[PDB]
Structure 1
Amino acid sequence: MKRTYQPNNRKRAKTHGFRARMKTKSGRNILARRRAKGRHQLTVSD
């Protein structure tokens, strides 16, 4: 009974990846929003 999470590394990083977020002002906003919150992770890149 198929589940929501089928992992896929190229998909996980093509979406969600730091280079992917940097392409868009929303994603650069996600990046700085995380740097400010001070997360250790910041992206699926880590």
Structure 2
Amino acid sequence: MKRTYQPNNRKRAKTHGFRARMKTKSGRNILARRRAKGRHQLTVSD
């Protein structure tokens, strides 16, 4: 019963990446949106 989550690191990191979110404005938004309220530890740390 194959499930949705098939972990594959570096796919995980290829999308979703700090490096990745930096390349576009939309994620860069999300990045600095998360630096904000939500003192969050985010992205490639997890």
TM-superposition CA deviations, 1:1-46 (whole Å, max 9, x none): 0000000111000000000000000010010110012343221345
**Structure 1 vs Structure 2: percent identity of aligned residues?**
100
- Provide TM-score, normalisation by structure 1: 0.84
TM-score (structure 2 length as normaliser): 0.84
CA distance in 1, matches of 2:4, 2:43: 21
Separation in 2 of the partners of 1:22 and 1:2?
Answer: 33
Which of the two has greater helix per residue?
1
**Pairing 1:6-45 to 2, within 5 Å after superposition:** 6-45=6-45
* Distance in 2 between residues matched to 1:9 and 1:43, nearest whole Å: 13
Q: Could you tell which deviates more after superposition, 10-19 or 29-38?
A: 29-38
Flag structure 2 segments of 5+ consecutive residues without an equivalent. none
Unaligned 5+ segments in structure 1 are none
